[PDB]
């Protein structure tokens, strides 16, 4: 609440889960994979797309 | 690097690192005779035949 409005750069404050490395229940980890001989530019375009 | 060839450097084709091989063209390294076709730049600046 402090570091959201009255700051210059993004500062989140959080608590670490007890099982320190698994899934945020409602939450996924998507991979957008470039397959053909493409360019990093085209991939980012796909990403924002 | 004439008759055998050589892996030299690595390049980036379409974003994938592949090898760089330099070797003689086919015709100048087939026949014992073609041995003659190859020279070495000596210490001085002269080419010396095989």
UniProtKB/Swiss-Prot annotation, chain A:
Induction: Positively regulated by MarA, Rob and SoxS transcriptional regulators (at protein level). It comes from the Bacteria. It is found in: Cell inner membrane. Disruption phenotype: Loss of susceptibility to contact-dependent growth inhibition (CDI); inhibiting cells still contact the target. AcrA-AcrB-AcrZ-TolC is a drug efflux protein complex with broad substrate specificity that uses the proton motive force to export substrates. (Microbial infection) Involved in contact-dependent growth inhibition (CDI), acts downstream of BamA, the receptor for CDI. Its role in CDI is independent of the AcrA-AcrB-TolC efflux pump complex. Homotrimer, with large domains that extend into the periplasm, interacts with AcrA and TolC. AcrA may be required to stably link this protein and TolC. Interacts with AcrZ. Part of the AcrA-AcrB-AcrZ-TolC efflux pump. Belongs to the resistance-nodulation-cell division (RND) (TC 2.A.6) family. This is Multidrug efflux pump subunit AcrB. The chain holds residues 653 to 701 of 1049 of the full protein.
């Amino acid at each position: 609440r402090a570091f959201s409005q009255i700051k210059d750069a993004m500062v989140f404050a959080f608590n670490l889960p007890a099982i320190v490395e698994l899934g945020t229940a409602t939450g996924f980890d998507f991979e957008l994979i470039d397959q053909a001989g493409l360019g990093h530019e085209k991939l980012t375009q796909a990403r924002n797309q | 690097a004439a008759w055998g060839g050589s892996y030299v450097n690595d390049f980036i084709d379409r974003g994938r690192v592949k090898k760089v091989y330099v070797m003689s063209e086919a015709k100048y390294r087939m026949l014992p005779d073609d041995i003659g076709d190859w020279y070495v730049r000596a210490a001085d600046g002269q080419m010396v035949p095989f």
